[PDB]
TrEMBL record, chain A:
This is Transcriptional regulator LasR. GO terms for molecular function: DNA binding. It comes from Pseudomonas aeruginosa (strain UCBPP-PA14). The lineage of its organism: Bacteria, Pseudomonadati, Pseudomonadota, Gammaproteobacteria, Pseudomonadales. Keywords: DNA-binding, Transcription, Transcription regulation. The gene is lasR. GO terms for biological process: regulation of DNA-templated transcription.
Length: 161, 153
């Protein structure tokens, strides 16, 4: 975990974080960070291997105002699973439909709240065959993921700022 | 953890947190939150001599909380000035020899700490005690922070 601290740059650090989450069973990973009182999601510090087509479309669609994981991160420190039950509006249902077309079907989102008021997320998708296999998997690794998201926040807030 | 969230009042919430920390091997805990909300069984005299001696600005855990989200294990390694050693010797007198502080930074900007002491006979044994529960502790601190900020403010 503390390799994340050691890393020189965003580049090597980004490569460690992706090895680490891949090692755990995840396929697509997003680390995002904003400084305190900023809603400029379209311009956050972003690391990982999320499909760039999804990220650009998400930007243009204004999906930061729709993504249920985003309003959740601004109010909570606790994980949110990409369960069908977090997609509660016609817009969020449609947001899920497009995220699926990009392979972001099963996963979770750990909110990040740093010591300097930084706000962000560690999102990780898993490539599973049904909600039951996805959820059992994510609960196994949840306690390692719970430590990892804060090491990422601390070393990651360090490189960005 | 879920029962922490099911808690209707601050009193049953602290009872839960105290029992969980106790079941995990800690005997004295402080949960402090600023927007200060204080729960736990810390020696009431210690919280008092703390403020009195203005120890907030010599105690290494406090400076670390303002700057990190990672836990800091209590140790005279950071208590290396002579007052910082009196601070430890005094904390030792109150039973707070071994333990760790989890910093708390909530979604709406709350600032705080979850401190947990362990009774142990040496630093090796103490760190084993805390390392072995660290993943569970890491979840506890965030569950406590979310549910505790929602019931403190
Ligand atoms: O506990 C703490 C940290 O407390 C904080 C920090 C920041 C905001 C608020 Br609110 C509370 N420090 C000492 C470690 C040790 C022997 C003793 C004392 O517990
Ligand atoms: O992962 C995320 C974004 O998280 C955040 C939150 C707050 C601040 C910042 Br900066 C980033 N959203 C979706 C999860 C899922 C199926 C899809 C989407 O991509």
């Amino acid at each position: 975990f503390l390799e994340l601290e050691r890393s020189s740059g965003k580049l090597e650090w980004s490569a460690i974080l992706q090895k680490m989450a891949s090692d755990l069973g995840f396929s697509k990973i997003l680390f995002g960070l904003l400084p305190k009182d900023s809603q400029d999601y379209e311009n956050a510090f972003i690391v990982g291997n999320y499909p760039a087509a999804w990220r650009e479309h998400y930007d243009r669609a204004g999906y930061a105002r729709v993504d249920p994981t985003v309003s959740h991160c601004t109010q909570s420190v606790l994980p949110i699973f990409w369960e069908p039950s977090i997609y509660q509006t016609r817009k969020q249902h449609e947001f899920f439909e497009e995220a699926s077309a990009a392979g972001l079907v099963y996963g979770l989102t750990m909110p990040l709240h740093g010591a300097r008021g930084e706000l962000g997320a560690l999102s990780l998708s898993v490539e599973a065959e049904n909600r039951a296999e996805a959820n059992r998997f994510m609960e196994s690794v949840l306690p390692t993921l719970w430590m990892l998201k804060d090491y990422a926040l601390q070393s990651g807030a360090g490189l960005a700022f």
